[PDB]
C-alpha cells in the first residue's frame, strides 16, 4: 500500500495472509485474500499460477504483522485451491483474476469468528456503488515502488471508484480494462495498491453494509498519474463463486 496508514487486523478482520512453503522449508509471503465464509478465502489466481499445488500454502487469519505471530491468529492448510479456468495474463492486464482457497486447520476445522476474525459479505449481482464512492484497500504490499522489503505492519488506505468510461481513456488503460474489472484511485494519485497487495480486498459500503467489491489485481506501476489500480469486479463473478463454494 502506497501512502495510507498502518492498521491492525481488528480493523479489517476478514483479511487473510497467504504464505508459501519453499523447497527447503523457508516460508515467504505470497498475497492477500479475504474470508467470505468460515471455510472459504477468496483471492487472485495470478498469485498461485507459478505454484498451483495446494500443499505448498499456509493461510493466516487474525494476523496483523508479516513475520510475527499476532496474538489470536489462526493457521490453516489449503484443502482445495481453485484457480479460475478462464484466467489469462497479457503483458499487464490479468483476466478472470480470482481464486478460492478452502481452508482447514490441522484439527480439521474452518474459521472461528472473533474480534480479529470475521467474514466479509459479497455484493449482490451486478450491484456496485457509484463512481466516486470511497472504498478501502488493505495489505502487506510495498510502501514505495522502489522498496525491496514489504512492510512488517499491515496497512490500509482509501481509494475512489473510477468509471469504466474514464478508465477507458487513452492516457489511462485504453482497452486493457474490461467490464469485469473495476478501477480505483486517489484524485491526487498519492495512495494506491502495489506489488504484494494482490488478492487483497477492496471494500465498499453499500446499503450501509461493508461489501467485498473488488480484489487487488494489477496496475501500471503504483500511485502513478492516470494509472489506477485495477480490481477484479466481484459483483460480476457471483455465479462462479456460488458454483465453487
C-beta of 124: minimal distance to ligand 9X9 in Å?
26
Position 149 contacts ligand 9X9 (CB under 6 A): no
198 counts as catalytic: yes
Measure CA 81 to chain center. 16
Q: Which residue has the cell 503504483?
A: 222
Angle at 141 between CA 74 and CA 121, to 5 degrees: 55
Question: In the bound complex, which residue of the shown chain has the CB atom lying closest to ligand 9X9?
Answer: 219
Q: Which residue has the cell 515467504?
A: 28
90 counts as catalytic: no
C-beta of 228: minimal distance to ligand 9X9 in Å?
7
CA 196/CA 216 separation, integer angstroms: 10
Closer residue to ligand 9X9 (CB): 74 or 182: 182
Report DSSP state, residue 146: T
Interaction mask 201-230, ligand 9X9, x per CB under 6 A: ---------------x-xx-xx----x-x-
Question: Among residues 41, 99, 194, 204, which is the contact residue for ligand 9X9, using CB under 6 A?
Answer: 194
Closer residue to ligand 9X9 (CB): 47 or 74: 47
- Distance spanning both ends of the chain, measured CA to CA: 30
Position 197 contacts ligand 9X9 (CB under 6 A): yes
Whether 172 contacts 83, CB under 8 Å = no
Q: Which residues are catalytic?
A: 46, 97, 198
Amino acid at each position: 500500500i502506497i501512502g495510507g496508514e498502518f492498521t491492525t487486523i481488528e480493523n479489517q478482520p476478514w483479511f487473510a495472509a497467504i504464505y508459501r512453503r519453499h523447497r527447503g522449508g523457508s516460508v515467504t509471503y505470497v498475497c492477500g485474500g479475504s474470508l467470505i465464509s468460515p471455510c472459504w478465502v477468496i483471492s487472485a489466481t495470478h498469485c498461485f499460477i507459478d505454484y498451483p499445488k495446494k500443499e505448498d500454502y499456509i493461510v493466516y487469519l487474525g494476523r496483523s504483522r508479516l513475520n510475527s505471530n499476532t496474538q489470536g491468529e489462526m493457521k490453516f492448510e489449503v484443502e482445495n485451491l481453485i484457480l479460475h479456468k478462464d484466467y489469462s495474463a497479457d503483458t499487464l492486464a490479468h483476466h478472470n483474476d480470482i481464486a478460492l482457497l478452502k481452508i482447514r486447520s490441522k484439527e480439521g476445522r474452518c474459521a472461528q469468528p472473533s474480534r480479529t476474525i470475521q467474514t466479509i459479505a459479497l455484493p449482490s449481482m451486478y450491484n456496485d456503488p457509484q463512481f466516486g464512492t470511497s472504498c478501502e484497500i488493505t495489505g502487506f504490499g510495498k510502501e514505495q515502488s522502489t522498496d525491496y522489503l514489504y512492510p512488517e505492519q499491515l496497512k490500509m488506505t482509501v481509494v475512489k471508484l473510477i468509471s469504466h468510461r474514464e478508465c477507458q481513456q487513452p492516457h489511462y488503460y485504453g482497452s486493457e480494462v474490461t467490464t469485469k474489472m473495476l478501477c480505483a484511485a486517489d484524485p491526487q494519485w498519492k495512495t494506491d495498491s502495489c506489488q504484494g497487495d494482490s488478492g487483497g480486498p477492496l471494500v465498499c459500503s453499500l446499503q450501509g453494509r461493508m461489501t467485498l467489491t473488488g480484489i487487488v489485481s494489477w496496475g501500471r506501476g503504483c500511485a502513478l498519474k492516470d494509472k489506477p489500480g485495477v480490481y477484479t469486479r466481484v459483483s460480476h463473478f457471483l455465479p462462479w463463486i456460488r458454483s465453487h463454494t
